[model samples]
Target: MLPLPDFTATFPEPFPAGPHSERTEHRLLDWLEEHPLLPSAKAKAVLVNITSHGASRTFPTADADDLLLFAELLLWLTAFDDVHAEGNGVGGPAALVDRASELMLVLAGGNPPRAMSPFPAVLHDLLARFRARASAAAYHRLAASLRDTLMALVWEAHHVAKPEGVALATYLAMRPHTVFIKTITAAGEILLGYELTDTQRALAAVRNLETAVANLAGWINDLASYEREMQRGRGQPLSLPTLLHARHGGTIEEAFTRASSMCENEAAVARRGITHLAHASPNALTAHARALEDITRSFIWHTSH
Candidate 1:
């Protein structure tokens, strides 16, 4: 088995405190009590640990209510990803994609189909609450992000099944969607009450910022999750570090070193993107970029813990 590397030092600055974090924790607990994704106490503790309550602190611009809402969304996504998306790939990705399609409808404020599964019902409840506070554009963007996430998962399933391992570049390209960073960032816009116009959102600088965050998030998670994944014996051919080691013979330390360098490069690009945007960016766009930075920092810190 490959040993873990010292990635703790590469993580970003200390986590910032949100004004509403304490209240949001209670809100999350209350929501979880109603939802009950995990049955056992220890399982519930794992759920809480994974949620990390970091979303609240990450988007300090959000109000107490928005913070709680984001926390709830994170909790649900984490549980869903662990149980279905990242589990034994025995369950075909098509079914998960279909479920995400239904979630897209729910997110669009359409009538949620009658279903026995708790996932769709949870999505409906989430969308209903989000619609009360967010714009239609945010709703649609989030729905699109979810669809993209499902597509990424499908691609990953295909990649993992291949006998030959994937290259580093290929894994990095697909990492953003599979990691769901787009969804998190789009959800960040709603939580922080900021909306960039379509043109602005499509700008090169704006896209650079988004891609940078996704790159960093995926690589950081790759390093952080390596040990846990290895323990489960599913570490092969998936994450950046593992793919690096698999496709190119190397030590785990070597894989981590390259991965960390890539993450740092992306962070540098994100900083440059923010600098370029700061000159003439709209208020909403500027705020959204800063919020992404905050969330990225908080995520790095949270994963370190």
Candidate 2:
């Protein structure tokens, strides 16, 4: 049996969102109510948390309307995660790849395919809004980020469903994509209307920074949600701490200590990467570094509360 670890001291202090949190939360609740997204009060309450405290916390600098937009995407992704990734289903990896491909088309700005589920319809609506707000490059980045995440979800599900546990190296490799870090960080770019050139996006320093940020977000989430996930009994093996414990031969507490140390190192790596980005577009790189900091801090805030 594994005990969950406390990560309060390991994470950084949260960044405060601007004054529109409460206002945007209200609007989000109203919008979810109007949209038929959730079925009951419980589902709606979940959306409230993601909007008010989760994504909203991440982008406190965004405008009220932009916060709502980000919240909506978070809400939609949460639903998608629950249904397609986390849930136990008869569908195998192939099924997930097929479904994700369908959704990716809409993300890439293709016409919506004929589908019966409300999920695709919701995606279509969101994609329309995303396309309106983003540049061709930005939209493509968004699409690629999402496509990769969904593919990662399929990989995660494959590992979770198998009796043989995942290897530590493989888990580390997949963690960035499986975590929603890239998707959420990309949302920040959309909100700020900032676009990174392909060269910049692929830079070693930039990639390392993003990697560090994602590790923080994903590992911290593993610690924060471990108990709830175990209670649900759906996908505990998918958690980073659990993988560390299982693969590296340690108690859950030991895994937590190791993971926390890694997270700290990664955060330091991110800061160093930011400093190295001076020759890149100074303003753009500075804003990006700030956004990455905010993203990590927001995760701390979200999981803490």
Candidate 3:
């Protein structure tokens, strides 16, 4: 048997690609292959349309057999948010879970440019089944919201067949869902004990995750606004979201490392102040007092950060 990865491993590897992946792959292949053959002229046109529009590059499945593998990587990476939330034996990491919820929003909204990466009808059906397992709010409300966004995105991207730059902006907004969750979760866990029951952790984690993801979402909208400004040559540099996990050659895991450091620093400060409290317990010691304060500060900061 292959060696398994640790649950709390700072970086995730050895991920279990879900069973649905293979099924989805097979479905996409069958759908594509079942189409009737055409004359050489028409075949050339088909090839041109698929390749010319840069479609396959957006969602590649070279032999159709690769569809499941593609599904496995992208879908599972999206699911890691929940795996972490449910880590430490308790099934709910509220904030982490909520972030996972946002990912579903991104997915339902069609995270990538859907017009660019058109899917087989069967593939859409399979993805819908995958989503059927989600919570009521996540499945219904978030899905509806995302579908609306996806439609708007469709208009922005092609405007009924004319490609525009908004496609890139949509990618910018939705792409960070993975990195943002990993970073925020790491910060919370490192600075505080992740050992608490899932129920307890969820309370704080949900609020924090919501705030962080919203910030990233807002940044994406700003990018679209900026692009419009630039095309007309508005003389200003529009700030892009800080690409901590993408551009610096630093992985998303590094964001967690920084978050942990912040937690540790906050913990240290709390220790100093709690130690000198006038009402300090008779048995209070410098180390213990510091740890208490440190943990508290770390908790609050991680939640807010």
Candidate 4:
């Protein structure tokens, strides 16, 4: 998929140039925007990550990789929400609680292959610690409900793919909500240390942070694995993903590097294309999209070649 033509330059606005169409065009759909829900601690962390990630897209600096990698940490948390009973993804708290019960039952009966590690264990620990600090029994209310909020989050992701499904205001609201969560959690840790004079609650924060860091590391692995595959496919028509998927026992970092190198090249080309498209203006979007397509196709074809 090519990027939008001159998307950066003719984007008609720079990164911070507000009042862009996104604000006027997009709409908010969920309760998170309208009502008070969970503490949204984890959600806040991921939002910060997304903002940072998006920023890297705009400015290429020495620490860009570090920021990008940190952004991935937030993505991991976002992905984790789907599995957590108190997920930020979808449905009411009751619905999430219900899914959590079902998931627990299933795991108790048999191990599901795709389920990531510390599944039930992680859920149990998080609920206990997170709810304890939230003050108002967030989990106690949802525990009996046994719903799955994560499914709602997944639905939101799919919805984002649709043109009208996502709204700019909604995105903006959500963008920082996750960061808020991170802040609350940190404050809770400090207050807990001051009030309770116990290491337990504070430790949970530490553990959560560590887990986030570890997951981010794993994403880097995937990125690297993708890169290696892309390198192997160079000079051949094969794409990055195709090469990595075909080559088992490879690392995520390898696959990712193969793909990212293309992103680097595509970024260069898009910069040039932006100058050309700005003057052409007639089919800017089409041109940009075509440029993106070349990179996308390149990623896909690595394996075949």
In candidate 2, the residue pairs with backbone N, CA or C atoms under 3 Å apart (3 or more residues apart, or in different chains) clash, namely: none
Compared with the true structure, all predictions reach lDDT values of: 0.71, 0.72, 0.33, 0.34
lDDT by residue (1-305, candidate 2, tens digit) is 44433434444454566677677678877776545656578877766765676665577677877787887887877777765666554466776667787787777655756765566777778767877888767766776878888888878877777523677777777777776788787878989877677777777878888877877777777777776766876645567777777777867778878876776776677667666775466577777877887777787676667
Residue 189 lDDT (model 4): 28
Who wins the lDDT comparison? Answer: 2
Clashing pairs in 3: 94-202, 95-205, 95-206, 267-294, 271-290
Off by more than 4 A, model 1? 1-12, 49-52, 91-98, 101-109, 163-167, 234-237
lDDT of 2 at 235: 49
Q: How many backbone clashes does candidate 1 have?
A: 0
RMSD to the true structure for each prediction, in A, is: 2.9, 2.9, 18.0, 20.0
lDDT (Cα, tens digit) per residue for candidate 1, span 126-232? 87787777798898788778777767776776666552466667777888887778878888888777888888888888888888888878877887777777688
TM-score of 2: 0.87
Which of 1 and 4 is the better model by lDDT? 1
Candidate 4 local lDDT, 230-302, one digit each (tens): 3554321122333443454365445445445544444444444434333433342333333222322222222
| Candidate 4 or 2, higher TM-score | 2
lDDT tens digits, residue span 1-305, model 3: 11111212221122222234334544533444543222244543433332212212222212233334333323333233223322222232354434334544445455432322123232344346535533343334323443343333323222212212224354445433422323222222222222223343244333333333333333433333333443554232222322332334454345334434433343343333343432433322322233233223222322222
Residue-level lDDT for 11 in candidate 4: 25
TM-score of each: 0.87, 0.87, 0.27, 0.25
What is the model-wide C-alpha lDDT for candidate 4? 0.34
